Design a protein around this ligand. Structure first.
Ligand code: HEC
Ligand code: HEC
Ligand code: HEC
Ligand SMILES: [Cr+3]
Length: 68
């Protein structure tokens, strides 16, 4: 993937793989040999996302992902 996208019922969380890998670097999320990050509604709301945001981009809280 490169620009993973997820259509939600209350907004959207257009993810990024390549566009992100740029700043991230895989390891940023994964750790030696990828596979998955089990995202849905529990982790994506944890360190998963909320962690490497409060610094760049700007909106890290509500509105960040779910385009509001
Ligand atoms: C305001 C603080 C928020 C509301 C309202 C919702 N979120 Fe999020 N969110 C994020 C991700 C990466 C996901 C996983 C994608 C997936 O669903 O597979 C989610 C998911 C949701 C869900 C689940 C949707 C459903 O009912 O199927 C809901 C209801 C939801 N989010 C509401 C990411 C982010 C995030 C990144 C910056 C923020 C700040 C929030 N979500 C905050 C909200
Ligand atoms: C959970 C899978 C994530 C969601 C939801 C979002 N990200 Fe990120 N993110 C990071 C940086 C350094 C930026 C700015 C630079 C860039 O991405 O190249 C972003 C940006 C966003 C955006 C806006 C993208 C844009 O160019 O406008 C959204 C919607 C977004 N992120 C949602 C960093 C990180 C990161 C650090 C390791 C992680 C794990 C994530 N982002 C994950 C999520
Ligand atoms: C660096 C270029 C990489 C590599 C080698 C991998 N990714 Fe990621 N990844 C992230 C998340 C949240 C998931 C799960 C998505 C969800 O369930 O919503 C993934 C998943 C993977 C896979 C498995 C999925 C598949 O494509 O079948 C693989 C093989 C993978 N990744 C490899 C998150 C990030 C991310 C932070 C948002 C960054 C940067 C990357 N991934 C980058 C990489
Ligand atoms: Cr919450």
């Amino acid at each position: 993937a490169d620009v993973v996208t997820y259509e939600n019922k209350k907004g959207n969380v257009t993810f990024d793989h390549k566009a992100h890998a740029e700043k991230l670097g895989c390891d940023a999320c994964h750790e030696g040999t990828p596979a998955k990050i089990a995202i849905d509604k529990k982790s994506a709301h944890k360190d998963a996302c909320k962690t490497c945001h409060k610094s760049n981009n700007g909106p890290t809280k509500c509105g960040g992902c779910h385009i509001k």
